[PDB]
Structures are given as structure tokens and as C-alpha cells.
Amino acid sequence: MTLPAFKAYDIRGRVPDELNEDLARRIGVALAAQLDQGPVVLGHDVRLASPALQEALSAGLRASGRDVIDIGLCGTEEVYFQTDYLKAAGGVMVTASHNPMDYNGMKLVREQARPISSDTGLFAIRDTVAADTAAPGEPTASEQSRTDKTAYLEHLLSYVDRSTLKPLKLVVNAGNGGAGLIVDLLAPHLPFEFVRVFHEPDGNFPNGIPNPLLPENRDATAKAVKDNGADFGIAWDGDFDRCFFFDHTGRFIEGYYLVGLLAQAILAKQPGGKVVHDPRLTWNTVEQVEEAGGIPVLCKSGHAFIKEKMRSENAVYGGEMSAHHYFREFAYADSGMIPWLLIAELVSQSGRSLADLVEARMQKFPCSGEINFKVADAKASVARVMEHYASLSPELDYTDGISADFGQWRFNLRSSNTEPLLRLNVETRGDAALLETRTQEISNLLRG
Numbered sequence: 001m002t003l004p005a006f007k008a009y010d011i012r013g014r015v016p017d018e019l020n021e022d023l024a025r026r027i028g029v030a031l032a033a034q035l036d037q038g039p040v041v042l043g044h045d046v047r048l049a050s051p052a053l054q055e056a057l058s059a060g061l062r063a064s065g066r067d068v069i070d071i072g073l074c075g076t077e078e079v080y081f082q083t084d085y086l087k088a089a090g091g092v093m094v095t096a097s098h099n100p101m102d103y104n105g106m107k108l109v110r111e112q113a114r115p116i117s118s119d120t121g122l123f124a125i126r127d128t129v130a131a132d133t134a135a136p137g138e139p140t141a142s143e144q145s146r147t148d149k150t151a152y153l154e155h156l157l158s159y160v161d162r163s164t165l166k167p168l169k170l171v172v173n174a175g176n177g178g179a180g181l182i183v184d185l186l187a188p189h190l191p192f193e194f195v196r197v198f199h200e201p202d203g204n205f206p207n208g209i210p211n212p213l214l215p216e217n218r219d220a221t222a223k224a225v226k227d228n229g230a231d232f233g234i235a236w237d238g239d240f241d242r243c244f245f246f247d248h249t250g251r252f253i254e255g256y257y258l259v260g261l262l263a264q265a266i267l268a269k270q271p272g273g274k275v276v277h278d279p280r281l282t283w284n285t286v287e288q289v290e291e292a293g294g295i296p297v298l299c300k301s302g303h304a305f306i307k308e309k310m311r312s313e314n315a316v317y318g319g320e321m322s323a324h325h326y327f328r329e330f331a332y333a334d335s336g337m338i339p340w341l342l343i344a345e346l347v348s349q350s351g352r353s354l355a356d357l358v359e360a361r362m363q364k365f366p367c368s369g370e371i372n373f374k375v376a377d378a379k380a381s382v383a384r385v386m387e388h389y390a391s392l393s394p395e396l397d398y399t400d401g402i403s404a405d406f407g408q409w410r411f412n413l414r415s416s417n418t419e420p421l422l423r424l425n426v427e428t429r430g431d432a433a434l435l436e437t438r439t440q441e442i443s444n445l446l447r448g
């Protein structure tokens, strides 16, 4: 067969069956043969296995003559930023994002933090590793320990005018992932009062997997916000490349509406910029980008596609409805920290709550949120939906699965590139009853 840990965008597996130290080391040797010249930046997340996997990966790399720069415990965006900042040949983050306790993985980038996908070298690494039968060589290169985050921190703060910031009260929920360490390093430079929930890094995840979409993690943050009268709350996944917002009532804000709002914040600083967005949910983003003088640029979802469209278009900002936010000045990479700094500045400067900033957008373009399906025949399921609606003549688009625009409502339906699921997203023009009917009706066609 082929190695199962090698997914489309990255390496995800169960330790030690699909991913282990010998596989990691072999990945190190194979990566040395794919990169242009320069050192390799390594980082890892809080998971229990992640240091041992990094040590193995460093050994394979140094056996093949690449210097390693170990930046230690970190979030995924720091490997991206440090790879670009230090002009390294590439970087590797050991992490399993939001996945179960027995999982780990790796995200790989080349120069300027460009992603390595199955498309673009990750499957060439897989093939090399699959065949590499050789014995581990000895380290012929060094490992430098570069744990200082000053440049990263200074970079993050540069997005906001610190003298316009009000002493807002913010709940932060790191889910025992790694985000609280960055918060605690920024706190001395910010006027905010932080209310820290599930703050300490703990790879045993005592309070559960860092995944804010799970209702127990959701309710922990929503409750902290109401109990403390915070202005809003922020929660991250384990490696904090995803950021989720809660308004002052404790209400979870669908990542879709943050794309348009962050867009407007950015185009206030860089007028006439291009903004990259995905096709799942579109109408609110397009109108807000245009209202702000920007240019909306549609792109297939998935972080490797977004980053490339942004480079090739010189887009100032890009956003997915799955809580990934991308910034040109951040090596065209995603950050889970920049978003909430931008929102904090917006609230401070406008005198508006986060709830009021999004309220009218949510009523103007209600959406279903992402709904996932395991079905028997994904093709036959999709066929049934298209059959049922063909007599209404929807405008179709195949940029990313199927988008069907009916005028007053639309949906996107697409297979996942990382799970064997169908993902559904629906939205209407200010009609919540139509939203519910069409979402139930489509759900029925899918399952039946």
C-alpha cells in the first residue's frame, strides 16, 4: 500500500502505528533532498510525543547535512514566521492540531513558508521514505537553539496602534494548548485585562482536546465571558492557527462573519487591497470587501491553495470560514493571534461591541454553518441533490465542489480533502426560514 499518515496537506497519524520516530527521522532525510539550500526550522506543540518526534526529525536532517534551528514549544504560525524571518530553507511543525490524544503529525513548509503539499513535494517525500531502507547516518550538522520570540512578538504588535487601545476585558481559552504562552508574553505590552481559562499548556488535555467547536469547550468560554462581563472571548485550537470568537453575551460567532469584518479592518490600513476568500460562504464577504474599497478574489478552500492565490495576487488578506486567517505581511501565512488583536483595535476605536459589529451581517446573510455527512455513495448523494433542484435553474460553479446560486439562497457542497466526508454550507439573503427549510431538505436528499 502507501503510508497512511501522509494526507493531502500534511502528515497526520496515530502514534506509534502510523507515525513514529523512525518514520520521522526518515522524513527528515527525505526533506533534506527536497529543499533549496539553508537551515531547517523545527518547532513542536504541547502533545506528549512531539519532542521525541522533533528530536528524531532533527537527527535525520542533521545526518544529511542540514543545520537545524530549534525554536522549541511554539504554535504553528511561529514555524511559518521564523522560517521566513530567518530565510531558512524550510520548517516543520510537529503537531496534530485539534485531533485526539493518541495523534500527532507534521506540517511542512519550504522557503518563505511556502506550503509543501502532496501536490508539491509531500508525496515525493512519502515515496522516498517508503523506499528508504538505509541505516541512520550520524549527525554531520549542528542544532541551534533559538527560543527567543521577540521578533515574532514585535511583528504581532505592529498590526495595531497601541495608543488607540482601550482597557478591554477579554476571556482567552487556550484549551491547554500553546496559545496562553503568547498571550502572557503580549500582556505586558497591552492595556487589556485577560481572564484566562484552561491556560496552562498540558498535553494530557485534562479539560479535553483543544477544539472550541466541541460544546463543552464552547460552553467553558461562553460562561467565562458572561460571568466576568468580558467584552469578548477568544478560543484557539491546540497549535493556535485557528481563532474563534465569542461576543459579550457568550454567543459564538460563526467564522464566516469574521472574514468580512477582518477584511474591513485591513482595508482601512491598506486601501484597495485584494482579499482572498473561499467558496463555501461568499455573499457577506464579497459585499463587505467591496463596500470597503477592496477586491474579492475567490479561491478553492484549503490552506495550501489560499496561500498560493495570495502570493500570486499580492493579496493583503485572506480568510476561510473554518477560522483560518491569512496576512500578507505575515509571510502570506495564517496566524491565530493577529485576528484578535485586529478585532480588539476595532472595538477600541469604534466604540462598538463585537456583537454589534456583526449583528446586521448575520441577519443580512444567515448561514447554516458547516454540516458534515458520512453517506454510502457520496456521488449518488450529490446526484440526488442536483436532480431535485435542476428544475429551478441554479447558477453553478465548480471551483470547489459544487456551488449553486438560486438568487435568494445558495449552497456549496464538496468532499473533504482530509476526511471522507461531504461538507454542506447554506446561506440566504436575510431569510432564516428559507435557510432552515433548504438545509433540512438538502440534508434529507443527502442521507436518503
Ligand SMILES: O=P(O)(O)C[C@H]1O[C@H](CO)[C@@H](O)[C@H](O)[C@H]1O
Residues within 6 Å of the ligand: 009, 301, 302, 303, 304, 320, 322, 324, 415, 416, 417, 418, 419, 423
Ligand atoms: O477537510 P477540508 O475541508 O478539505 C480542509 C480543512 O482543513 C484545512 C487545513 O486546516 C482548512 O484550510 C480548510 O478550510 C478546512 O476545511
Ligand SMILES: [Ca+2]
Residues within 6 Å of the ligand: 097, 098, 237, 238, 239, 240, 241, 242
Ligand atoms: Ca490547528
